[PDB]
Amino acid sequence: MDIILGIRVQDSVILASSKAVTRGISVLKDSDDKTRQLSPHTLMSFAGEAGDTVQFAEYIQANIQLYSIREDYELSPQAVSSFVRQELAKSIRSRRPYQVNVLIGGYDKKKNKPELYQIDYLGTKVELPYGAHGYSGFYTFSLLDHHYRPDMTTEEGLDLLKLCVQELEKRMPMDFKGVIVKIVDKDGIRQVDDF
Amino acid sequence: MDIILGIRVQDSVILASSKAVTRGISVLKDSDDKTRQLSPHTLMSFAGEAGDTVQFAEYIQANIQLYSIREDYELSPQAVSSFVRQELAKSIRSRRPYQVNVLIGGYDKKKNKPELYQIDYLGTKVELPYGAHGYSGFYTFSLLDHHYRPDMTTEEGLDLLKLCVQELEKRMPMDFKGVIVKIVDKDGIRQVDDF
Amino acid sequence: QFNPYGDNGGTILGIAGEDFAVLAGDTRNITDYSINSRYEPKVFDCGDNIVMSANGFAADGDALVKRFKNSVKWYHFDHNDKKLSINSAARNIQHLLYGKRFFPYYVHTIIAGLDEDGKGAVYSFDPVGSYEREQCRAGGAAASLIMPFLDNQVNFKNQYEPGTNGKVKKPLKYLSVEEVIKLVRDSFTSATERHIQVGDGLEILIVTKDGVRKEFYELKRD
Amino acid sequence: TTIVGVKFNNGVVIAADTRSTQGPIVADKNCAKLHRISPKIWCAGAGTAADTEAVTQLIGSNIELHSLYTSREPRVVSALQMLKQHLFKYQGHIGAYLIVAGVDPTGSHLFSIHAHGSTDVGYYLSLGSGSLAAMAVLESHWKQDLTKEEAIKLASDAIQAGIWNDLGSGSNVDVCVMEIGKDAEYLRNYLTPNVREEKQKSYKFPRGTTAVLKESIVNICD
Amino acid sequence: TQQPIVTGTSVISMKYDNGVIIAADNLGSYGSLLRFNGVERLIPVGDNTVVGISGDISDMQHIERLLKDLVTENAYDNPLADAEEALEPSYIFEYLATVMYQRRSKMNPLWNAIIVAGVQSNGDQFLRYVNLLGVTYSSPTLATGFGAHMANPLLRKVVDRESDIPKTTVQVAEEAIVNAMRVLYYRDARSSRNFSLAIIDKNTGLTFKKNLQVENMKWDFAKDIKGYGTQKI
Amino acid sequence: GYDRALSIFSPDGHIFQVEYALEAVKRGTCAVGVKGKNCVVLGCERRSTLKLQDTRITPSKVSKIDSHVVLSFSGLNADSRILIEKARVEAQSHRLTLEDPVTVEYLTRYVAGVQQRYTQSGGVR
Amino acid sequence: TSIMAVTFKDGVILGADSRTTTGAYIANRVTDKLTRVHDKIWCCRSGSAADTQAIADIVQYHLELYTSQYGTPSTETAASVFKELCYENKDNLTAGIIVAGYDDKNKGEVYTIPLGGSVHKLPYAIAGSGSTFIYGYCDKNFRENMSKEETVDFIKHSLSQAIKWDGSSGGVIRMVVLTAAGVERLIFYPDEYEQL
Amino acid sequence: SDPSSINGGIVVAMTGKDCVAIACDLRLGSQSLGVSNKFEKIFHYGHVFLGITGLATDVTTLNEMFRYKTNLYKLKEERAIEPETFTQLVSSSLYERRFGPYFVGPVVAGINSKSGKPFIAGFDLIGCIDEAKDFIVSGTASDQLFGMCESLYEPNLEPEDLFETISQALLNAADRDALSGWGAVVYIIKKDEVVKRYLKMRQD
Amino acid sequence: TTTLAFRFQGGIIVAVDSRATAGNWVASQTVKKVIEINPFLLGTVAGGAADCQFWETWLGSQCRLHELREKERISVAAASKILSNLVYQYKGAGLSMGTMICGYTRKEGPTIYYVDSDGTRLKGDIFCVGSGQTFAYGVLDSNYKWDLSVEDALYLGKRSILAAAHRDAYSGGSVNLYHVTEDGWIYHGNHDVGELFWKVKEEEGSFNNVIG
Ligand SMILES: *[C@@](C)(CO)[C@](*)(O)[C@H](CC(C)C)NC(=O)[C@H](Cc1ccccc1)NC(=O)[C@H](CC(C)C)NC(=O)[C@H](CCc1ccccc1)NC(=O)CN1CCOCC1
Ligand SMILES: *[C@@](C)(CO)[C@](*)(O)[C@H](CC(C)C)NC(=O)[C@H](Cc1ccccc1)NC(=O)[C@H](CC(C)C)NC(=O)[C@H](CCc1ccccc1)NC(=O)CN1CCOCC1
Ligand SMILES: *[C@@](C)(CO)[C@](*)(O)[C@H](CC(C)C)NC(=O)[C@H](Cc1ccccc1)NC(=O)[C@H](CC(C)C)NC(=O)[C@H](CCc1ccccc1)NC(=O)CN1CCOCC1
Ligand SMILES: [Cl-]
Ligand SMILES: [Mg+2]
Ligand SMILES: [Mg+2]
Ligand SMILES: [Mg+2]
């Protein structure tokens, strides 16, 4: 767990998440998917403390899927992000808090708009055009401040994302073994296999 | 400073040293040469605490060069390694010790034999067929235990070295930005430009 | 601040034969540099041809033995007086020990007896319950002195056949009860010489199909 | 350690056990704790083994040079003064606890010195880990106007109390008698009540048991 | 988690041919202050057991109440309370040992060292130790605190092993105990001259001696001792 | 807490409360299940004494427990919601721990187990 | 320790117990805490045995060298030398010293030197762990210009109580009498003073 | 960060009938990592043998130091240093660094050339001499070696028998210690011949 | 400890050492670090001996209860998740466990799951766990191919443990081999390093650092 990025463009949300899983002086895995599909048009990437991350992600996934079955209806990305925030807001004052930071990328079908939410382990939620957790932000935010435009296409967003990954691969101390990129739009969620 | 390796083969000593110089969350340089030529047939690679490493390497280099001028004669790798060990052995009980680990690869012209010495910051010297400092050893030693043969050529040694770098690039957590490889033999010291 | 643990010293030793097993232990009980008792037994007959010793912190040792003895009693009540096999006893002890995983019994436990094929058995436990059947085990203060000697003399480690160029190992064989008791006595006299917490007396419990026999020997009292 | 000193009619006697420890391990079973400062001034040492040996030799050396300078036999108070001032200077970091005794032109003397440089005078004294065991015996059996044979008995009894009851002390009893007008007699291993019993078995291996890889003659000559 | 406040020092004891002897001084120390001087630290239970307690006095008084209550509880619905079903030393000890270990296991110990001395119904001598940690052991001689370091060596010269017990009379055994108490008065900075001594014999029963004093002390040689090395005056 | 044993045996060996619960099922609207070679069909009756209904929002008789399992019923409508909710939760819990959706037999076994628990628990019918 | 020094009509008397401790163990039950720095200038030692001995040895050396050059030193001079050592090395010393001496001009004098290294001239002085328990008693019972027998009784009764209550004090009660007549050593054993 | 158990290693010495034996393992590691399997811990100056366990840099430093001092000794004295004298020199040199000591466990072994008496001795890190008739042990498996030697040893062993005893003492002690092993060397020392044998042991 | 297990053409190889340490004290050379859960499931153990042993022995009971209740052998995924969910409950309490759940089922095929005491659960083809994992990785990665034969794969797993047993001070004793196929696990013997090292050195010509 280290690098998770998010970029909201005109018609979609793009999430990039690093593939490396390290413990000690060994990279145990280089093909790890740090994300779960909460609903057909909502995707959550995650990063933080070992064990906590997946346990939390799947717990949220289960709750959202339960809601979908009960109401035969998909929750809006805004509604999901508010639910997730509250869970983390409870967590932080628990005996043992979830040390998990997340990005929630979703496509609101009622508004026909992509939405990207950044929530830290304290339960601090913000809607953003582009987001990142951990040390990634220290490079990507300034880069996106410069190159990002609000009316960009998905293809332009992927090129913008390639520019971030290249910078991280150049200046980051740790080898994060590339990223898995996923796109969230009106047609749902799909994975870019060649990045 | 992180990865320094050494492999003594039939007719030469091969030193591989990582190019990355990191501080904090930034790779400041990716083309750093972590070695100094002590004499025409003796090369010392180094790794450890920032500042100490180069300060120590150059101090040794100066002393050996001074000896060469005074006597119009090149010290043997064994003699140089003993001098270096004593300096570190003094250092460890100083007010502020040099936190520097070194490998000394050399070609003894009188014996017509390559020699590789591994010396840590405490002044612990050992002659070896292959050596490493830091976390590198935890991967490379077992690998070399398997693949190394004493009668190998320089070309076979470079392939053996490529096998080490590949393993380190696969399993090491940090990005060390490849290695600069140098060969020490009867004709002196030369650098492999394409690795 | 109150420290709930203490070190009562002493050392124990278990060796298994073909149709027997011994569990020995010195009778000295200490705290710091003082002797509390020159004869305080810590090797106990627990019934069903099982002998047990829990060396280390005596209070925890006595508690454990007391609880296992009680476990044997209730095993009879609940399962129609069935004999508790040594392998079943060992697993039961694991659960006793691990039950206090987060406030452990500070003891090295050893039990000895006969397995269900009638062959000698020795089991040893760490403080939190990991266990293993072995031919040989020393535990306690002087375990580090005795154990390598047992490797050499019981399991014939590092011993090769003369004149075979170190190619043929010395063949493993069971030892007689007479030969085992010699190794026990020599182990404890050696340990007494070089370890201050070991001495006073040696008590050996021998387990055969006939029952549990005892033997006592003097050790140096300095 | 256990060390004692006892005054009598025409002189003084000191004694010591012979155990040397390294944690709970007995490193030396027969080390000499009675040191010669001068021919008729002897010293029993407890605490850090290197320190007691080093500090006694240094003062013993300087006493010899002083004796040659002054053309006089050295005095116990001179050794006492030089030791305490040296030990005080190092603020207890030199862990030497000494019983200093001897005879000189002034008479017979008995003192103790502690690591921090404090000195005490007495007719009977005891230092070391087993000083309480020894002092119990001294307090029970000491009287004024002891003879030579009575003082040796009392001293060795006080050491024995340490040997048996203190885990820090053991093995043998060394004694040194310093009587006025006579040569001091150093009784090395005066008592040996801790002899190792015969081993049950000989562990002499058959020749060729150990596997060998290489042989070579080593050159010790020029 | 506790710290002891008002404390009692050594309790010493030994076996002899027909029974057991136990002793303890009458002091209740408050750190270096020798605060209370009328403290009884030997507590008889029935006519066949004496419990000697050292360490924290508040916890000692709690244990007194438990033993007092134990006698009451044993008498309930028990026609043989003063005969076959009377309290044995072994019953009293095991009870205390159970409590001591339960309390250490709850990290709230009774800050004491206890010696239960008595004679069983079959005439056998009982002498066993238990402390704040729940640690138990038995020996021909037992002692707590400074007693362990100074008394035991002296008492072991009389009874060094099991076979020496029948050879030791009550006269010899008491003499050794009284001597040990004197040595402790010389050398233990938290001890007093006044003490109590109890003898539990299988024939003559329980003899409880109060208001004893250490006597026949050697102090005269002190006048000859001058300075700390050189000084002659 | 209310402890009363409501479901109990009678002299003839019957639990009347369980049998009277079956009468409530017999009162309920008809439901039918027919399984073919490659499909299952769930048919359900809806009584026509209720006109002026809003069929968009009125609770449907067939309920999805998961994306692959459905549950229809006959009897008390309010009671059915409790079973459906429990079944839906268990369906998600099974996916979470076993990493695989429930079998139809498993989901049935769970629902049936809930129904049984209410036949020998105090305070409940 | 329990120590005290008391001036009286004919001169001054020093008093002390004889107990030395390591924790609760009594290392020496017959200690001599009254020590000579000059013919008729003595001191009572409390605190670290090593420190007080080292100090007293140095003072004795200084006063011996003083006497060789300038003749007999005053009691004030001795107290000044003690002070100089205790004050300048206050960080490394644990020594509570009472200096007492007899001049023919100045008669009996008592100076006390606590941990800090300050000097205090007094009619009488008490110090050491066991002194705390006898402040009340000594204040109520002390009178100036007492006789020798009265001063001996005052010290004996005082130290008896200090010993009775302080665990760190005990053994024999040593005393040293300083008058024009000379130097007299007195000793009093438990059997006498305990039952006062 | 315990200097005496970073590199690991062991040395053991024994006396026999008109002979002495000294033996050591070959491991040099950095905690868990094994680095060298050729690191010998026994040196010799003339006929006097010195084994040194502990921190490897100090093992090397002290060897070089005692080579230095014995060479000057021989030039001035015009004779080789004897084991009894060398023992005192080691003690002096170690205690000189009392408050900044070499983290070592040295072991002297040899035969006095004049008297012919077998001699062995051991030291703590600050130079306290531990003389012994029977045996001396040192290193990370000292407890193990003490246990092996105390049981296996018997007096007046012949050189060929003494070899088997010391070798079995070292091997079985080393196998119960994680930081010791990786090969072993045994020196058998007679009055005027010395045999050096490399032992075959398990390489884990 | 050193333990590994890798996936390949012919199923799964699992290899472990047998050493147990208490600090630098070598406590045992004959510990069984492969737990046989059922004929189709294996579990490797590394870390705290009692924690691993107790809880993987407990895991086998939970897997038995599954097949009684469900009339079907538990999946490798479900088995590993029972253990990972268990240790996650004890997170922060100080459990020390590095385990690998290896096995075959019809729906999954050959599968390996890495599970550790801080709650990490990872599916993968190759894993090495323990104090000597890096030493095993070095040999294993540099010689690994998917198309290895059963004979070559068994040897590589054995050789990788040997490599770690040699270099890692806290690994050794003997090598325990296992091979997991569609028909279940197959034991391939206990191999003492005492004999295996010299046998491998001579035949392979490797370990030239050591004095032959
Ligand atoms: C009784 C026997 C006390 O038990 C006596 O008081 C004797 C005194 C006699 C021998 C003169 N005391 C000892 O034997 C003494 C006990 C001791 C131990 C440690 C500190 C103080 C006192 N033992 C020693 O001094 C041994 C002598 C050996 C056996 C030859 N030395 C050690 O134990 C040294 C301690 C050195 C030391 C350094 C700095 C301050 C104080 C002491 N310890 C080691 O060598 C342990 N370790 C071995 C591996 O290398 C790292 C150090
Ligand atoms: C009464 C008793 C208290 O005020 C008197 O003042 C006497 C004065 C006389 C002796 C001149 N004081 C003592 O007896 C004095 C009390 C004391 C203790 C510690 C610091 C200051 C004062 N006792 C000592 O000085 C003893 C004398 C020895 C035993 C002969 N020394 C110790 O107790 C040493 C002192 C170490 C020390 C510490 C700080 C400064 C100087 C010296 N302590 C130990 O050895 C500690 N010991 C280690 C083993 O575990 C038990 C404690
Ligand atoms: C390699 C060898 C090292 O990592 C492996 O990982 C093996 C795994 C095998 C055994 C399954 N691990 C160990 O050998 C493991 C290392 C370890 C130790 C302690 C904590 C974590 C990891 N060793 C143990 O678990 C040993 C096994 C015994 C010796 C058979 N056990 C102990 O060290 C025990 C229990 C430790 C403990 C854990 C949790 C709570 C309390 C205690 N401790 C002791 O026996 C204490 N000690 C032994 C020496 O004598 C004094 C007392
Ligand atoms: Cl003093
Ligand atoms: Mg008093
Ligand atoms: Mg080993
Ligand atoms: Mg190993």
Supply the DSSP string of H56-95, one letter for each residue.
HHHHHHHHHHHHHHHHHHHHHHSSPPPHHHHHHHHHHHHH
Helix B154-171 and helix I133-143, axial crossing angle in degrees, nearest 10: 120
Question: What is the 8-class DSSP label of residue H191?
Answer: S
Which residues of I line the annotated binding site for bortezomib? 49
State the distance from the centre of ligand 7 to the C-alpha of C204, rounded, in angstroms: 35
Residue type, E184: L
Per DSSP, the three-state class of C5 is coil
End-to-end CA distance of chain I: 26
What's the burial of B183, exposed, middle or buried (CB within 10 Å: 0-12/13-18/19+)?
buried
CA nearest to E86, candidates E96, E78, E94: E78
Q: In what order do the strands lie in the sheet with D41-47?
A: D34-38, D41-47, D96-104, D107-113, D119-121
Q: Which helix (H) or strand (E) holds F80?
A: helix F77-98
- The structure tokens listed for H48 are 């006097």
Tell whether G48 is within 8 A of chain D (Cβ).
yes
Residue B43 to residue B106: CA distance in whole angstroms: 6
What's the burial of I203, exposed, middle or buried (CB within 10 Å: 0-12/13-18/19+)?
exposed
What is the SS3 string spanning chain D?
Answer: CEEEEEEECCEEEEEEECCEEECCEEEECCCCCEEEEECCEEEEEEECHHHHHHHHHHHHHHHHHHHHHHCCCCCHHHHHHHHHHHHHHCCCCCCEEEEEEEEECCEEEEEEECCCCCEEECCEEEEECCHHHHHHHHHHHCCCCCCHHHHHHHHHHHHHHHHHHECCCCCCEEEEEEECCCCCEEEEEEECCCCCCCCCCCCCCCCCCCCEEEEEECCCCC
Residue B91 to residue B97: CA distance in whole angstroms: 5
- Residue ranges of the domains in chain C? 1-222
End-to-end CA distance of chain A: 19
- Is E150:D138 a contact under the CB 8 Å cutoff? no
Residue H90 to residue H49: CA distance in whole angstroms: 12
State the Cα angle at E171 between E169 and E176, rounded to 5°: 95
- Residue ranges of the domains in chain H? 1-204
- The structure tokens listed for A20 are 């490396």
Residue A119 to residue A88: CA distance in whole angstroms: 9
Classify domain H1-204 by CATH architecture. 4-Layer Sandwich (3.60)
**Residue ranges in B43-149 assigned as alpha helix (H):** 52-71, 77-91, 137-147
- The structure tokens listed for I201 are 């050195």
Residue whose tokens read 């976390």: B135
State the Cα angle at G152 between G148 and G158, rounded to 5°: 145
Name chain C contacts of I202, Cβ cutoff 8 Å. none
CA nearest to E133, candidates C64, G89, I136, C6: C6
Q: Which helix (H) or strand (E) holds A185?
A: strand A179-185
Residue C152: left if φ>0, alpha if ψ -120 to 50, beta else—which one?
A: alpha
Residue D36 to residue D22: CA distance in whole angstroms: 24
CATH number of C1-222: 3.60.20.10
What's the burial of C215, exposed, middle or buried (CB within 10 Å: 0-12/13-18/19+)?
middle
Torsion of CA C11, C16, C20, C24, to 10 degrees: -10
What's the burial of E216, exposed, middle or buried (CB within 10 Å: 0-12/13-18/19+)?
exposed
- The structure tokens listed for E172 are 């010899």
What's the burial of I136, exposed, middle or buried (CB within 10 Å: 0-12/13-18/19+)?
buried
Residue E18 to residue E168: CA distance in whole angstroms: 9
Residues with CB under 6 A from ligand 3: C 104, 126-128, 130; I 1, 19-22, 25, 27-28, 31, 33, 45-49, 52, 96, 130-131, 170-171
Residue type, G59: V
Torsion sign, CA atoms I94, I161, A20, A65: negative
Q: How many CB atoms lie within 10 A of CB I70?
A: 15
Long-range interactions of C187-190: CB distance < 8 A, separation 24+: C187/C13, C187/C138, C187/C146, C187/C149, C187/C150, C187/H151, C188/C11, C188/C13, C188/C24, C188/C26, C188/C146, C188/C217, C188/C219, C189/C219, C189/C220, C189/D196, C189/D197, C189/D199, C190/C145, C190/C146, C190/C149, C190/H147, C190/H150, C190/H151
Classify domain D1-222 by CATH architecture. 4-Layer Sandwich (3.60)
Q: How many CB atoms lie within 10 A of CB I31?
A: 20
CA nearest to H27, candidates H188, H174, H138: H174
* Count of helices and strands (H, E) across chain C: 4, 12
Name the residue at shortest CA distance from atom 24 of ligand 3: I49
Residue type, E126: F
Query: A116 CB contacts (<8 Å, ≥6 apart)?
Result: A6, A7, A8, A13, A103, A104, A105, A106, A127, A128, A129, A130, A131
D31 lines ligand 1 (CB under 6 A): yes
Q: Which chains touch E (3 or more CB pairs under 8 A)?
A: C, D, G
- The structure tokens listed for G178 are 């300083």
**Candidate from I21, I55, I174, I175 with most ligand 3 atoms within 8 A of CB, to mutate:** I21
Residue whose tokens read 């029963």: E205
**Cross-strand bridge partners of residue A107:** A114
Residue B118 to residue F48: CA distance in whole angstroms: 94
Residue A3 to residue A136: CA distance in whole angstroms: 6
Per DSSP, the three-state class of F105 is helix
Residue whose tokens read 């998961």: F66
**Cross-strand bridge partners of residue A71:** none
- Is I150:I6 a contact under the CB 8 Å cutoff? no
Domains of chain I: 1-212 (3.60.20.10)
Residue whose tokens read 């001395």: E117
Tell whether H93 is within 8 A of chain B (Cβ).
no
Residue D124 to residue D143: CA distance in whole angstroms: 10
Q: Which helix (H) or strand (E) holds B120?
A: none
Residue D181 to residue I35: CA distance in whole angstroms: 81
> Solved by what technique?
X-ray
Query: F72 CB contacts (<8 Å, ≥6 apart)?
Result: F31, F33, F42, F44, F61, F62, F63
Residue E64 to residue E67: CA distance in whole angstroms: 5
G23 lines ligand 2 (CB under 6 A): yes
Residue C15 to residue C135: CA distance in whole angstroms: 6
- The structure tokens listed for F78 are 């309010």
Domain G1-196 has CATH 3.40.1170.60: no
Residue D96 to residue D23: CA distance in whole angstroms: 18
Query: D34 CB contacts (<8 Å, ≥6 apart)?
Result: D14, D15, D16, D42, D43, D44, D174, D175, D176, D186
- Is A28:I133 a contact under the CB 8 Å cutoff? no
Q: How many residues does chain G have?
A: 196
Query: B195 CB contacts (<8 Å, ≥6 apart)?
Result: B162, B165, B178, B179, B180, B181
Per DSSP, the three-state class of B135 is helix
Q: Which chains touch H (3 or more CB pairs under 8 A)?
A: B, C, D, I
- The structure tokens listed for G86 are 């205790």
- Is I192:I201 a contact under the CB 8 Å cutoff? no
Q: How many residues does chain E have?
A: 233
Contact: D209, C162; criterion CB under 8 Å: yes
- The structure tokens listed for I161 are 């443990």
Helix F77-98 and helix A52-71, axial crossing angle in degrees, nearest 10: 150
Question: What is the 8-class DSSP label of residue C92?
Answer: H
- Is D56:D23 a contact under the CB 8 Å cutoff? no
Question: What is the 8-class DSSP label of residue C48?
Answer: T
Q: Which helix (H) or strand (E) holds B164?
A: helix B154-171
- Is E78:E86 a contact under the CB 8 Å cutoff? no
Chain I's closest residue to H198, CA to CA, is: I211
Nearest to H5 among I24, I132, I171 (CB): I24
Contact: A173, B175; criterion CB under 8 Å: yes
- How remote is the C-alpha of C46 from its chain's centroid? 13
What's the burial of A85, exposed, middle or buried (CB within 10 Å: 0-12/13-18/19+)?
buried
Q: In what order do the strands lie in the sheet with I126-130?
A: I126-130, I2-8, I11-16, I174-181, I184-192
Contact: I121, A21; criterion CB under 8 Å: no
- The structure tokens listed for I65 are 């209860």
Long-range interactions of F37-44: CB distance < 8 A, separation 24+: F42/F70, F42/F72, F44/F72
Contact: C97, I28; criterion CB under 8 Å: no
Query: C27 CB contacts (<8 Å, ≥6 apart)?
Result: C37, C38, C39, C40, C41, C42, C200, C201, C202, C203
Query: A194 CB contacts (<8 Å, ≥6 apart)?
Result: none
Domains of chain B: 1-195 (3.60.20.10)
Residue whose tokens read 């992600």: A57
- Residue ranges of the domains in chain G? 1-196
Contact: I119, A29; criterion CB under 8 Å: no
Query: G106 CB contacts (<8 Å, ≥6 apart)?
Result: G74, G75, G76
Q: How many residues does chain F have?
A: 125
- Is D52:D35 a contact under the CB 8 Å cutoff? yes
Residue C202 to residue C22: CA distance in whole angstroms: 13
Distance from CA of D118 to the nearest CA of G (A): 4
Domains of chain E: 1-233 (3.60.20.10)
